[PDB]
Amino acid sequence: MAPAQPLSENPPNHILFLTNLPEETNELMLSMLFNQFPGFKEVRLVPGRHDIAFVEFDNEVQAGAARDALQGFKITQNNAMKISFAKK
């Protein structure tokens, strides 16, 4: 219940890897959505999958900007997309 401990240290992180974002979605799509951000560094969305997104954004302000921009991509209409920072 909200402990006063130094829990987590990397956050906010600038690498968001996860899936749950398919539906003819693609690499130039996610590359332009990720492109929106000057942080546009790594974009991995392309196998038969078209549903596993690996986004490396120069910095977390821009990774956080992209993530906060599409922070609830209702694929949930079947599934709410899942993007998980490279928390380590």
UniProtKB/Swiss-Prot annotation:
Cell location: Nucleus
Residues covered by the RRM domain: 14-88
Family the UniProt entry places it in: Belongs to the RRM U1 A/B'' family.
Function: Component of the spliceosomal U1 snRNP, which is essential for recognition of the pre-mRNA 5' splice-site and the subsequent assembly of the spliceosome. U1 snRNP is the first snRNP to interact with pre-mRNA. This interaction is required for the subsequent binding of U2 snRNP and the U4/U6/U5 tri-snRNP. SNRPA binds stem loop II of U1 snRNA. In a snRNP-free form (SF-A) may be involved in coupled pre-mRNA splicing and polyadenylation process. May bind preferentially to the 5'-UGCAC-3' motif on RNAs.
Quaternary data: U1 snRNP is composed of the 7 core Sm proteins SNRPB, SNRPD1, SNRPD2, SNRPD3, SNRPE, SNRPF and SNRPG that assemble in a heptameric protein ring on the Sm site of the small nuclear RNA to form the core snRNP, and at least three U1 snRNP-specific proteins SNRNP70/U1-70K, SNRPA/U1-A and SNRPC/U1-C. Interacts with SFPQ; component of a snRNP-free complex with SFPQ. Interacts with IVNS1ABP (via BACK domain); the interaction is indirect.
Name of the protein this chain belongs to: U1 small nuclear ribonucleoprotein A
Shown part of the complete sequence: 195 to 282 of 282
